[PDB]
């Protein structure tokens, strides 16, 4: 089942609903990464960027990946583990996307790229954890990054920063194991 898996899928749907009623821009003004240093103390923004989606294929594609991989981490390593991966990856993939291309980005695939990174590496270095990423998916993941380099209009810094975060954490966690 997974409480931290469902809470995030419900948050993303609640916020998507609001973007349909109020328009994208109206939600963006309030949930996006701070665009002005004066707003730096609006702490929610460092995380809230991750809840915003721009089409139905955007949310569905993301929530599917979140369910498959997020649910697997939560099931085997617990709710606390998936919380910490989510918070650290959302903050850092946000920070890198803002530097690459400014603050107008949104979506969960920064968290998703860190999950792909964590589940793959953790499954190779600590097979006993009981999670893993299939080879057929580590290829789709890699095609997905590079298809963003050569363009749609993806947040490329989010993708690469997320991936990096998730490898790092999976490495650290495959020492302590």
């Amino acid at each position: 089942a997974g409480p931290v898996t469902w809470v995030m899928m419900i948050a993303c749907v609640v916020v998507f609903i609001a973007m349909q009623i109020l328009g994208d821009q109206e939600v963006m003004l309030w949930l996006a990464w701070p665009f002005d240093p004066t707003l730096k103390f609006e702490f929610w923004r460092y995380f809230t960027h991750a809840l915003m989606h721009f089409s139905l294929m955007h949310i569905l594609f993301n929530l599917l990946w979140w369910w498959y991989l997020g649910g697997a981490v939560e099931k085997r390593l617990g709710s606390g583990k998936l919380i910490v991966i989510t918070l650290i990856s959302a903050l850092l993939s946000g920070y890198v996307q803002q530097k690459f291309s400014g603050p107008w980005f949104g979506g969960l695939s920064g968290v998703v790229f860190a999950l792909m990174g964590y589940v793959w590496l953790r499954g190779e270095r600590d097979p006993q954890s009981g999670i893993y990423l299939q080879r057929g998916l580590i290829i789709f993941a890699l095609i997905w990054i590079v298809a963003g380099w050569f363009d749609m209009s993806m947040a490329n810094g989010a993708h690469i920063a997320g991936l990096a975060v998730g490898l790092a954490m999976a490495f650290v966690d495959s020492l302590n194991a």
Partner: peptide, 5 residues
């Protein structure tokens, strides 16, 4: 705007 993706 850029999608995370």
């Amino acid at each position: 705007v850029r999608m995370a993706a």
